[PDB]
Amino acid sequence: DIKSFLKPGEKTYTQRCRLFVGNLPTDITEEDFKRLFERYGEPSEVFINRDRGFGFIRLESRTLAEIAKAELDGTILKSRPLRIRFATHGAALTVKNLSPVVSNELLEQAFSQFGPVEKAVVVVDDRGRATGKGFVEFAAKPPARKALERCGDGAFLLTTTPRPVIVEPMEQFDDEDGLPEKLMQKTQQYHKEREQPPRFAQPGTFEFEYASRWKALDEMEKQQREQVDRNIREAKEKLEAEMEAARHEHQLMLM
Amino acid sequence: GEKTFTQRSRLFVGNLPPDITEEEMRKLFEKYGKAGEVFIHKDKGFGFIRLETRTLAEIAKVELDNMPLRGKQLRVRFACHSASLTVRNLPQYVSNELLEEAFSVFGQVERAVVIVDDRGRPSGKGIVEFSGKPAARKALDRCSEGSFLLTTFPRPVTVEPMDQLDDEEGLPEKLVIKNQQFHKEREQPPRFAQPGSFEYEYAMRWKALIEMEKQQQDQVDRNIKEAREKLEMEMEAAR
Numbered sequence: 001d002i003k004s005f006l007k008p009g010e011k012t013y014t015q016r017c018r019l020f021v022g023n024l025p026t027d028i029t030e031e032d033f034k035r036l037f038e039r040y041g042e043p044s045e046v047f048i049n050r051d052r053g054f055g056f057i058r059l060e061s062r063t064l065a066e067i068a069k070a071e072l073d074g075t076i077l078k079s080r081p082l083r084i085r086f087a088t089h090g091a092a093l094t095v096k097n098l099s100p101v102v103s104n105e106l107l108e109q110a111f112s113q114f115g116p117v118e119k120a121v122v123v124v125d126d127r128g129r130a131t132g133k134g135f136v137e138f139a140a141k142p143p144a145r146k147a148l149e150r151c152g153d154g155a156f157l158l159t160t161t162p163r164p165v166i167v168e169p170m171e172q173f174d175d176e177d178g179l180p181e182k183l184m185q186k187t188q189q190y191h192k193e194r195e196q197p198p199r200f201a202q203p204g205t206f207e208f209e210y211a212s213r214w215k216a217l218d219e220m221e222k223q224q225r226e227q228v229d230r231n232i233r234e235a236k237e238k239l240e241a242e243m244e245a246a247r248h249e250h251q252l253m254l255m
Numbered sequence: 256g257e258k259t260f261t262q263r264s265r266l267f268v269g270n271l272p273p274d275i276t277e278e279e280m281r282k283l284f285e286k287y288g289k290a291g292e293v294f295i296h297k298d299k300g301f302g303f304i305r306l307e308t309r310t311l312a313e314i315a316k317v318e319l320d321n322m323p324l325r326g327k328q329l330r331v332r333f334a335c336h337s338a339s340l341t342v343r344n345l346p347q348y349v350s351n352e353l354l355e356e357a358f359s360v361f362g363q364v365e366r367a368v369v370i371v372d373d374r375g376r377p378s379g380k381g382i383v384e385f386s387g388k389p390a391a392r393k394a395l396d397r398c399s400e401g402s403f404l405l406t407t408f409p410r411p412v413t414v415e416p417m418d419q420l421d422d423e424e425g426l427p428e429k430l431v432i433k434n435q436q437f438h439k440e441r442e443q444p445p446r447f448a449q450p451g452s453f454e455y456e457y458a459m460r461w462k463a464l465i466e467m468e469k470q471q472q473d474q475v476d477r478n479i480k481e482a483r484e485k486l487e488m489e490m491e492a493a494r
Contacts, residue, residue, distance in 0.1 A: 005317045063317050070257075070309035088373070097465065101440045103428040110445030122426035126335075126419050130426055155448040155458030159440040162454035164462055174375070175382055178368040181350035193348040193406045198357035201402035201409060210409040210490050211402030217486060218344070218413060221479045228471040235464055243457050250453045 002041040005063035013044040014118040015137065017058050017065045018087035024053040025078035033057070036077075040068045056087060085176065091144035092137045092170035098122060099159045100130040110158050110165075111136045114150065115143020135170055144169075260291040260305045262336050262365060262384070264312040268319075269301040269330035280304055283324075287315040303334055332424070338365075338385035339417035340394060345369065345379050346406045357405050358383045361397065362390025382417070391416070409490070 006012065024033070033048045033055055040059050048055035059065045065086065073084040095107065108120035116139045123131045138144045150156070151167035158165060184190065201211040268280065277293045284290050284304055291305035306312040312333065320331040342354070355367035363386040370378040385391045397403065398414035405412055431437065448455035 005314070007317060008321070063313050066313050067310050070313070097461075099440065101431060101437050102426070103431045104425045105428045106441075106445070113445065121422055121424075124421045124424075124426050126421075128421070128426075128430070131420060134425065135422065150447070155455060155462060156445070157443070157448055157454065157458060158445050160443040161440060162448055162458040162461065164448070164458040166465060172373040173378060174371045174373075175368055178351045178371055178381075179349070179377060181352040184348065184350050190348050193346065193408060194353070196404070196407045198353070198360070198403070198405050200397070201404055201411065206494070207404065207409040208402065211404060211411050213486060213490075214410045215402065217479070217482055220482065221475065224475045224478065225472065228468065228475060231471065232464065232468045235467065239460055239464055243460070246456075247453065 002039070004041065004060045005067070006061045007063065010061060011118050012060050013058050014062075014139070015058075015087065015089050015091065016062050016118065017060065018045065019057050019059070019065055019069060020054070020083075020085045020087045021057060021072075022054045022083035022085075023080050024048070024055060024082065025080060026050060026053060027078065028053065028055075036072065037068055040064045088172055089137055089170065091139070091141045092135060092172075093144055093147060094168050094170045095134040095136055096132060096166035096168070097163060098130065098132045098134055098165065099161060099163050100132075102130070102134070102158050104134075106158060107134055107136065110156070111138075111147060114138070114147035115140065117143075136167075137170075257308070259307045262334070262386075263309050264306045265334040266304050266306065266312055266316055267301065267330075267332045267334040268304060269332070270327045271295070271300050271302055271329070272325040272327050273298070273300070274325075275302065283319065283322075284315055287311045335419045336384055336417065338388045338391040340383045340385075340391055341415050341417050342381040342383055343379065343413040343415065344410060345377065345381050345412060346408045346410060347377075349377070349381065349405055353405065354381050354383060357403075358385075358394055361385070361394040362387065364390075383414075 004012075021033075021036075028048060028050055030046065030048050034043065034046055034057075037043060037057050037059070041064060043057050043059060045056060045058040047057075057068075059068060069084045069086070072082060074081045076082075098107070102122055104120055104122050107122055108117050111117050111120055118137045118139050120134065120136045122134045125131055136144075136147065138147070148167055148169065151165055155162065155164040156167070157163070201208040268283075275295060277295060280293045280295065280302060281290055281304075284306065288307045288311050291307070293302065293304050295302040306315060316331050316333060319329065322329045322331070345354075349369055351368050354369055355364045358364050358367060364383060365386050366382075366384045368382045370380045370382065372378050383391075383394070385394070394414055395416065398412065402409075402411040403414070404410070448458045
């Protein structure tokens with residue numbers, strides 16, 4: 001028997017345990033595919049597209065999936081290196097405008113009204129203070145869509161203070177494979193752009209004069225965005241004062 | 256085999272007893288094969304240890320996290336890559352290798368990646384991971400003081416320290432500051448504000464302010480895009 005490596009409170013066989021496996025031999029059988037991952041315990045999902053040379057496998061815990069990926073990624077099968085990556089999460093949402101009293105557990109509890117939640121996290125900075133952002137990953141897409149639609153139409157509240165949660169699909173980006181040089185076409189535009197090597201703009205040159213103008217443009221964008229942040233703080237301060245006055249008004253109307 | 260003792264097998268060990276030693280740290284991780292560099296931040300209550308492989312670090316982390324040690328409950332996590340930088344305003348034709356080559360002038364680059372969106376299109380952002388903090392500090396100082404150009408196009412890149420956010424452990428209930436304001440805030444459960452109520456009005460006005468921020472930021476995007484397209488024209492005509 002193999003260890004599960006489940007972490008405290010971790011749900012089993014979640015989408016975070018799902019691995020994409022590419023560049024498989026066309027001779028790949030479902031039994032041989034299972035065999036490759038046998039050391040990582042029982043899988044709950046096993047899919048293989050023999051002709052397309054790819055498959056999916058779901059392991060019990062995030063740790064077993066990290067181990068399987070670390071150990072098997074790049075392994076040579078019938079002269080080809082295997083490509084193993086975590087499967088893109090199909091039901092992940094980003095949450096914004098969270099109160100600092102919202103914990104991972106409260107966010108999970110709140111979002112479970114929409115359907116089963118695999119995980120919910122309140123994001124904290126290096127100091128361990130709430131950023132106001134978080135994420136919610138559902139077991140399936142219909143609950144994620146329900147949470148997206150309902151939180152967009154209505155005002156979903158997690159606390160006494162009617163601070164509404166902002167819900168958006170989680171942005172997915174690859175910071176793993178990126179843009180390899182070998183897959184970049186050596187066109188004339190590539191050549192014109194790659195002609196000059198990485199360098200610091202030389203004082204007294206046309207490059208330096210223009211790079212200083214680009215620095216100026218970056219500085220104008222920073223100023224303008226900070227000016228919007230300022231307008232928003234003034235408006236938020238105004239809204240808070242108006243609502244405290246409106247709270248007193250609402251309460252004083254009642255017998 | 257893969258390169259061993261990389262930053263991918265480096266663990267953070269927090270809430271250490273004040274009398275912890277480098278040999279005690281090694282003894283704690285002895286079951287998890289050979290250990291490389293051990294570094295303890297004195298009187299801070301935290302330290303680092305490099306294990307040989309990612310498998311060994313994954314196992315040690317799950318098995319040793321929350322372990323009681325002399326009254327303390329240890330916290331074992333994958334260490335945040337300290338010597339990592341975010342690079343913004345990347346020009347076209349920047350490959351991961353060119354990014355590595357570019358930043359290799361400041362010191363030893365462990366890895367560099369050009370971030371691609373969910374459809375493989377470059378985001379204009381990249382990550383540069385150095386082996387040590389002095390090399391990352393050099394890149395930060397030099398790229399702010401000078402104009403660092405990765406390609407022919409004279410638009411310098413912006414290099415910032417990587418924002419280190421704990422999106423793994425986040426804010427557990429046990430760590431939230433408990434006080435009267437906290438209990439007051441938790442008296443109303445998660446719910447949708449009901450149309451007609453004071454809370455619905457307040458929350459809808461709060462959404463309108465969020466929508467105003469969004470509109471104003473989209474206006475700055477449009478102004479800057481226009482400013483950039485004008486500068487590109489002036490630069491091409493002055494060549």
